[PDB]
Tab-separated table of C-alpha atoms and ligand atoms in Angstrom:
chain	number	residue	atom	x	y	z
A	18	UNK	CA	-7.660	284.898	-70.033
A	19	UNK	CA	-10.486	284.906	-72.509
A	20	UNK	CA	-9.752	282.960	-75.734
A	21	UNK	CA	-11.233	283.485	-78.675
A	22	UNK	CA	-12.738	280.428	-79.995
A	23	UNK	CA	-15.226	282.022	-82.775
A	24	UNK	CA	-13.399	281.557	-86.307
A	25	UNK	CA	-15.412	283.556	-88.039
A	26	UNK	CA	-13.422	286.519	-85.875
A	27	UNK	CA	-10.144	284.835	-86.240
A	28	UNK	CA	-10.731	285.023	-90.097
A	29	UNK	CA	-12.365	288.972	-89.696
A	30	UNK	CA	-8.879	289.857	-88.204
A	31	UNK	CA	-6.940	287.821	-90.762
A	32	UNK	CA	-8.815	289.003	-93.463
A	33	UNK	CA	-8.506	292.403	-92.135
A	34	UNK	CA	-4.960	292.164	-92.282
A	35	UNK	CA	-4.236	291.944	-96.474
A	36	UNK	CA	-1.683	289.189	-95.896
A	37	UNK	CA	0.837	288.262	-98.750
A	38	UNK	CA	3.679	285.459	-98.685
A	39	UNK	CA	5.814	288.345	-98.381
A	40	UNK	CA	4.596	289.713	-94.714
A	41	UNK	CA	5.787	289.199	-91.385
A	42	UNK	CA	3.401	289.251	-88.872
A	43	UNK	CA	3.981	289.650	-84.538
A	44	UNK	CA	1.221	288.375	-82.442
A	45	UNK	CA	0.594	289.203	-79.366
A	46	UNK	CA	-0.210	285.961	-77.044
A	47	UNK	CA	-0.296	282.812	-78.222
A	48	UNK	CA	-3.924	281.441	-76.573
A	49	UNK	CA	-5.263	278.375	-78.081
A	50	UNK	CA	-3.203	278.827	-81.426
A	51	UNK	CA	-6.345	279.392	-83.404
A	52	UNK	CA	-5.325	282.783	-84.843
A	53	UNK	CA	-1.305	281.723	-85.153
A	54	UNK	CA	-2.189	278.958	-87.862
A	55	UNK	CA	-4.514	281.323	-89.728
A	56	UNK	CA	-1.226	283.728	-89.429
A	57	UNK	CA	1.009	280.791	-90.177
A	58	UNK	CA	-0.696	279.633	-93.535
A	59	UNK	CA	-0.833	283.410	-95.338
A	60	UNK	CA	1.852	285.280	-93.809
A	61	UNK	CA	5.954	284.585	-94.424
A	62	UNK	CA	6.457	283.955	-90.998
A	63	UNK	CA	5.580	284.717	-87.275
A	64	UNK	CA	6.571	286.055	-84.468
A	65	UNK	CA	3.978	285.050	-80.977
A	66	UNK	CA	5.407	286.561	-77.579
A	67	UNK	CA	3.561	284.588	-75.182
A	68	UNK	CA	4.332	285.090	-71.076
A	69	UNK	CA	2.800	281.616	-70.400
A	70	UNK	CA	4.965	278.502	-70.516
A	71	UNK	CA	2.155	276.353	-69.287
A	72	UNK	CA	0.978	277.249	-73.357
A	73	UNK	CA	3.974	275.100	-74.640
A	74	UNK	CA	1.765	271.951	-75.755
A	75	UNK	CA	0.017	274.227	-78.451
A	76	UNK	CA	3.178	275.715	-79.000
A	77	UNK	CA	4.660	272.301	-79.939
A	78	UNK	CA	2.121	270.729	-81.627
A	79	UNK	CA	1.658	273.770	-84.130
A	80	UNK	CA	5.653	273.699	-84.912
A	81	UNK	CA	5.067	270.392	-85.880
A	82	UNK	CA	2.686	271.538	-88.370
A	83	UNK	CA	4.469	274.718	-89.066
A	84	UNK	CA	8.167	275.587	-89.662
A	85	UNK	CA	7.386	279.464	-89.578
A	86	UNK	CA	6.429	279.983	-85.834
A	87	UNK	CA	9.094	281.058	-83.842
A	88	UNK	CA	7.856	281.920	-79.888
A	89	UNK	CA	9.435	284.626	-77.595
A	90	UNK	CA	8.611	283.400	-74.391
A	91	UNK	CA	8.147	286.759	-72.237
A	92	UNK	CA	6.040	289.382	-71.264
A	93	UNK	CA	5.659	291.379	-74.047
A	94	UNK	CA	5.485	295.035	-72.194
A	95	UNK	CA	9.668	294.344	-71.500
A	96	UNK	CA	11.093	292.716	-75.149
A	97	UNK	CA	12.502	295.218	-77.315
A	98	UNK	CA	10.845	294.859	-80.787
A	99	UNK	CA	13.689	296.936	-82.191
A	100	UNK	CA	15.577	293.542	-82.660
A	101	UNK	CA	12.110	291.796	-84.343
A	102	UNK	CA	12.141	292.390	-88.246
A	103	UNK	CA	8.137	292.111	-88.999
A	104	UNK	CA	6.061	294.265	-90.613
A	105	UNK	CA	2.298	293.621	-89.036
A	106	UNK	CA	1.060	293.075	-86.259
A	107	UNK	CA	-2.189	290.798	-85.397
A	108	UNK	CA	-3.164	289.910	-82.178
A	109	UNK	CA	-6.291	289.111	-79.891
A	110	UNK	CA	-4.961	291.848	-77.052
A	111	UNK	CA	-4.900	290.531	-73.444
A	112	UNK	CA	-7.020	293.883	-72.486
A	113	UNK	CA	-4.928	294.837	-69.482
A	114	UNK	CA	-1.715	295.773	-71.286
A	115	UNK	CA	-3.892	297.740	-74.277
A	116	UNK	CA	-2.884	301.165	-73.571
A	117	UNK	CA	1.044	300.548	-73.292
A	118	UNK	CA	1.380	298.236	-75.637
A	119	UNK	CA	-0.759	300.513	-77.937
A	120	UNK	CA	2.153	303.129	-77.891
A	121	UNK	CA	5.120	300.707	-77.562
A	122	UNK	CA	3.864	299.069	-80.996
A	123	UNK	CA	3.216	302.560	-82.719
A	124	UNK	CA	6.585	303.511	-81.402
A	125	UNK	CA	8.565	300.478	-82.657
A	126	UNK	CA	6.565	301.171	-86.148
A	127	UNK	CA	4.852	298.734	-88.740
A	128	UNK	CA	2.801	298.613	-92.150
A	129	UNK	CA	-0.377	297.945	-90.222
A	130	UNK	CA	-2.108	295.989	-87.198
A	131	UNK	CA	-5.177	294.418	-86.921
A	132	UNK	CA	-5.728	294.208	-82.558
A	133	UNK	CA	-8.619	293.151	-80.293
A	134	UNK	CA	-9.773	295.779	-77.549
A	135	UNK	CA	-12.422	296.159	-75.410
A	136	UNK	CA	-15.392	297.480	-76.919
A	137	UNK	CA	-15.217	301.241	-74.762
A	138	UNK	CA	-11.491	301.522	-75.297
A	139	UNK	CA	-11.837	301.178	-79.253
A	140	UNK	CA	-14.481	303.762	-78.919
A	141	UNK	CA	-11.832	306.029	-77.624
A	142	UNK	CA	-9.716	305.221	-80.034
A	143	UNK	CA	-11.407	306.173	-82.789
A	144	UNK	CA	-13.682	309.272	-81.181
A	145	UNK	CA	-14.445	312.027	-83.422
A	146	UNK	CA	-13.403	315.314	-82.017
A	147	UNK	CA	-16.595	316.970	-79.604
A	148	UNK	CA	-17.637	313.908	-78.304
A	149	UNK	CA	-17.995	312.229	-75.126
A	150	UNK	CA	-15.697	309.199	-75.999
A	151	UNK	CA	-12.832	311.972	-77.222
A	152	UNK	CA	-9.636	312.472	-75.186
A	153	UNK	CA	-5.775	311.823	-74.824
A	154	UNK	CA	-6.148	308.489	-76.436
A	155	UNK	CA	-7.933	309.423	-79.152
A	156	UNK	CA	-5.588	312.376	-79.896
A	157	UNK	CA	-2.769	310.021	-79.020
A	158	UNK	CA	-3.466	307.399	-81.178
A	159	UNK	CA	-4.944	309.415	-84.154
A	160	UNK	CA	-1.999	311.861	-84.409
A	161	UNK	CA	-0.061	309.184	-85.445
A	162	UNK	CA	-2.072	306.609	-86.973
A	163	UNK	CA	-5.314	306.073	-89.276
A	164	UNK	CA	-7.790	304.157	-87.062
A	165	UNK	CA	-10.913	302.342	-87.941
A	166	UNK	CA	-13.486	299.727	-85.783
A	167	UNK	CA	-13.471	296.770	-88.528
A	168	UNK	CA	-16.108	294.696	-86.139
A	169	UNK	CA	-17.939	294.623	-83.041
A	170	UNK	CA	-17.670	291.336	-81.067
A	171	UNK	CA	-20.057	289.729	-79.046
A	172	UNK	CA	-18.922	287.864	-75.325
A	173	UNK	CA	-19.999	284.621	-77.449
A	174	UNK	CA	-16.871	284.616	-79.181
A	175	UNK	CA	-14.835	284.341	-76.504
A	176	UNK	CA	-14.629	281.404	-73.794
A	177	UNK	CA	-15.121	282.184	-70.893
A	178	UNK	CA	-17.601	284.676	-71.780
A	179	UNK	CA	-16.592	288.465	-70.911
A	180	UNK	CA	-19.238	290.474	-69.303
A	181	UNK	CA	-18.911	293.292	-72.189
A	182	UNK	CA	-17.716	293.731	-75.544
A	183	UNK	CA	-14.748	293.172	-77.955
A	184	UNK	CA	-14.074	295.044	-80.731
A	185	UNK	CA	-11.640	294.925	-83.901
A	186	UNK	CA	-9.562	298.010	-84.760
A	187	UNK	CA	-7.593	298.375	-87.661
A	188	UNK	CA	-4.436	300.690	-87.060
A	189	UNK	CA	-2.657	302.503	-89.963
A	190	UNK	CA	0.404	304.814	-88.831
A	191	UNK	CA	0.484	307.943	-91.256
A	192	UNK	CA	3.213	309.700	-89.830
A	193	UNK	CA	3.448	312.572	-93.065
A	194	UNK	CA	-0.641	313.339	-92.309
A	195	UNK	CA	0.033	315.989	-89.210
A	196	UNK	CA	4.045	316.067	-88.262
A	197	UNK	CA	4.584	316.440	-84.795
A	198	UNK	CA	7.415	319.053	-84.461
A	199	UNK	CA	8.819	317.266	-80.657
A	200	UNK	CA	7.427	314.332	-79.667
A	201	UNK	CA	8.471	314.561	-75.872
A	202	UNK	CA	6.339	318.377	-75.642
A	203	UNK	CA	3.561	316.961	-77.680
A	204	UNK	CA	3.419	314.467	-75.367
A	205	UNK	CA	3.982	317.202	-72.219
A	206	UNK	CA	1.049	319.108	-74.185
A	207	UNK	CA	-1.623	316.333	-74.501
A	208	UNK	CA	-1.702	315.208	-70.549
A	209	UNK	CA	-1.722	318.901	-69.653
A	210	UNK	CA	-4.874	319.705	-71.692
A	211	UNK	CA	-6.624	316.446	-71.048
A	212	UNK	CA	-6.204	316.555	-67.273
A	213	UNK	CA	-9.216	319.540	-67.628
A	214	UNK	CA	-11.006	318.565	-71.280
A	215	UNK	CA	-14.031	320.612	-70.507
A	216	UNK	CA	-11.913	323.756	-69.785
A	217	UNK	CA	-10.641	326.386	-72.052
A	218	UNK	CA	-6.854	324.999	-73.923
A	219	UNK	CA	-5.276	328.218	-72.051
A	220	UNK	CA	-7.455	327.489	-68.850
A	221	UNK	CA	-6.249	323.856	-69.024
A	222	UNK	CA	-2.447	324.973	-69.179
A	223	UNK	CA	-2.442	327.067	-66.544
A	224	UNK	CA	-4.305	324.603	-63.760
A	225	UNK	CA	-1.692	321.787	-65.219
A	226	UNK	CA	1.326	324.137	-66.238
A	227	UNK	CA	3.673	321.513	-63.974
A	228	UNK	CA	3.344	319.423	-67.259
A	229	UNK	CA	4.903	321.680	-69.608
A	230	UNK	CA	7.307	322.787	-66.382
A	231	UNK	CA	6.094	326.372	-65.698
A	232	UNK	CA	4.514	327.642	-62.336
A	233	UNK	CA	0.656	328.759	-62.398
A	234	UNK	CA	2.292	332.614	-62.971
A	235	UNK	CA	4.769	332.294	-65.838
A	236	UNK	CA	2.203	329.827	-67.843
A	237	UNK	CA	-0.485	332.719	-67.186
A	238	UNK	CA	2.265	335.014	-68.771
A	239	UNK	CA	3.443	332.841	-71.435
A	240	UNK	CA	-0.423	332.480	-72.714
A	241	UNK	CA	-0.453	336.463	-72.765
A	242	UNK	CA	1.996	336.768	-74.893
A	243	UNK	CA	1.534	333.689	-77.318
A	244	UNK	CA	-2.192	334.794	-78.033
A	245	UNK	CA	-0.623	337.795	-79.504
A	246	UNK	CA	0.921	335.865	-82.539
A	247	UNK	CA	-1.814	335.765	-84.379
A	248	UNK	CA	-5.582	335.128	-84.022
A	249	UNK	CA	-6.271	332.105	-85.048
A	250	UNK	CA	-4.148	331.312	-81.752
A	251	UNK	CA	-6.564	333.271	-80.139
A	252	UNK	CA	-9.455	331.839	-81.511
A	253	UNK	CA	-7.877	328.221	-80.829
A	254	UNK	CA	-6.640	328.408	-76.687
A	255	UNK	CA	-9.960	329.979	-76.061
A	256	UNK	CA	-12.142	326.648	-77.218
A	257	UNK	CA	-12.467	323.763	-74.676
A	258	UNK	CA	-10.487	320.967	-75.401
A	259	UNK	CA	-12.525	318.332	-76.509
A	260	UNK	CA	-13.352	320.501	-79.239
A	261	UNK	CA	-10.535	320.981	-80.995
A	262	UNK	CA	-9.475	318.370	-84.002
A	263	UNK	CA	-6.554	315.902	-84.008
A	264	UNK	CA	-5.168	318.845	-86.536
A	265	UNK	CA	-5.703	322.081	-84.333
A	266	UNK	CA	-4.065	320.587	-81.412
A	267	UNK	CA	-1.509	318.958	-83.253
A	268	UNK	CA	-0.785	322.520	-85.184
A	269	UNK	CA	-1.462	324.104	-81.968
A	270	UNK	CA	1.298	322.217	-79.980
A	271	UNK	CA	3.785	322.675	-82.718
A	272	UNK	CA	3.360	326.551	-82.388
A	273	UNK	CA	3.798	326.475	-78.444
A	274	UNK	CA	6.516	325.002	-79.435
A	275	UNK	CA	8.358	327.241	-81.493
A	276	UNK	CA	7.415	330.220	-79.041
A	277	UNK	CA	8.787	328.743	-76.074
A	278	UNK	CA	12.404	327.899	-77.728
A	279	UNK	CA	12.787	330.960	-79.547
A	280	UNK	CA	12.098	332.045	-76.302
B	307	SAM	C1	-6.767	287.428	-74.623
B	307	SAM	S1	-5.770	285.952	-74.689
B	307	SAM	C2	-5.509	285.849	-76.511
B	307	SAM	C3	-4.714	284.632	-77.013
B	307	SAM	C4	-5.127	284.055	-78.406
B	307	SAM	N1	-4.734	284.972	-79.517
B	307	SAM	C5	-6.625	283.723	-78.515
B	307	SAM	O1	-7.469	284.609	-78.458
B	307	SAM	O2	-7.025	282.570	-78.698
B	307	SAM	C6	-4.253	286.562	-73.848
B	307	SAM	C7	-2.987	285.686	-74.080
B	307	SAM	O3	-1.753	286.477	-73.967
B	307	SAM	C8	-0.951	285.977	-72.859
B	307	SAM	N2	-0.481	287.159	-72.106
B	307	SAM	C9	-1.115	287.801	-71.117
B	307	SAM	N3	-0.364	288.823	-70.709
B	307	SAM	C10	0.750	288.837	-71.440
B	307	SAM	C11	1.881	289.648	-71.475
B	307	SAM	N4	2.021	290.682	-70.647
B	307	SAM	N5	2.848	289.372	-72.365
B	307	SAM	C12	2.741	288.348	-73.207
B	307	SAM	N6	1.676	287.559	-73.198
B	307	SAM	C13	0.671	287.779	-72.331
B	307	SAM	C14	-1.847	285.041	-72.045
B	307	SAM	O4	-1.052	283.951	-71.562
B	307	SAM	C15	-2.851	284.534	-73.078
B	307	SAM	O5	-2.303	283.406	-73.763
């Protein structure tokens, strides 16, 4: 595990974070404790899953300090935060759970988080559409959620030191900005088109149709007969993938949508 031992970052990510008396914050591993004081002395109280029991000495000493730490000892991928009543989330992100833990947090809902990634994966992130560093997660994440890189991090604020990069993204869910119309097809939709994002949309549906459970044929059909809508359809299953906005395929998904039931 790579702790972060640079305050200047654990007060970025605090900072970051707009605390009042009247927040409750969940972090994500507890580490060395140097980020759960910060979170201690400005929020109302926290919540710090940690999987680690051999951790317990810093957990002790700091709830002798503090009487607003209360630690979930578990792995943090299997506790159901439905049960949890916070409202942020800041955490320095053990990087091999990122992507689940990404959408399990989004899911669950909050005001905002403040999370540590690897440098590439916050790239992703927060890719504008037509670039090299946009697909699924960017869509993913973006379709439901403002996202922003609030600092780069070097491998000296971290010991041991990393061999790359650490960055600090600042997540804001905005679930009125594009209104997904199912979130199980959307879902269906995204992997289909991402599994060939230099392709045509249509092209892409067709070589993946399994996703969206239609054989090569009936997909081929369906797209036929959905172009003829309207043309900004047309003009929008033609481009390749990785050219299309967070707003095209999101209001492109929604349509498929509505065809397919009403038929
Ligand atoms: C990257 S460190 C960050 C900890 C601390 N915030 C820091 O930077 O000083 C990862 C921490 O999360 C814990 N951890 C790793 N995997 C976990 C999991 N699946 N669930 C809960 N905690 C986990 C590790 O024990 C370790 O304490």
């Amino acid at each position: 595990q790579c702790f972060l031992i640079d305050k200047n970052f654990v007060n970025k990510a605090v900072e970051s974070a707009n605390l009042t008396k009247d927040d409750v914050v969940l972090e994500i591993g507890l580490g060395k404790g140097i980020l759960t004081e910060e979170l201690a002395k400005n929020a109302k109280k926290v919540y710090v899953i940690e999987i680690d029991k051999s951790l317990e000495p810093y957990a002790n000493k700091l709830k002798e300090l503090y009487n607003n730490i209360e630690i979930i000892w578990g792995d943090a991928l299997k506790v159901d935060l439905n049960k949890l009543d916070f409202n942020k989330v800041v955490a320095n992100l053990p990087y091999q759970i990122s992507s689940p833990i990404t959408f399990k947090l989004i899911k669950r809902g909050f005001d905002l988080a403040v999370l540590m990634y690897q440098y590439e994966f916050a790239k992703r992130m927060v890719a504008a559409a037509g670039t090299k560093d946009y697909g699924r997660l960017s869509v993913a994440v973006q379709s439901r959620a403002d996202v922003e890189i609030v600092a780069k991090v070097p491998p000296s604020a971290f010991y041991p030191k990393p061999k790359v990069y650490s960055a600090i993204v600042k997540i804001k869910p905005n679930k009125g900005k594009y209104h997904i119309e199912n979130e199980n097809f959307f879902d269906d939709f995204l992997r289909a088109i991402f599994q060939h994002r230099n392709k045509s949309v249509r092209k892409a549906l067709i070589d993946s149709s399994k996703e969206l459970n239609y054989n090569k044929d009936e997909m081929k059909k369906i797209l036929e007969d959905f172009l003829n809508t309207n043309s900004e359809i047309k003009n929008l299953i033609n481009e390749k993938v990785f050219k299309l906005s967070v707003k095209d395929i999101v209001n492109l998904s929604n349509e498929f949508y509505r065809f397919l039931q009403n038929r």
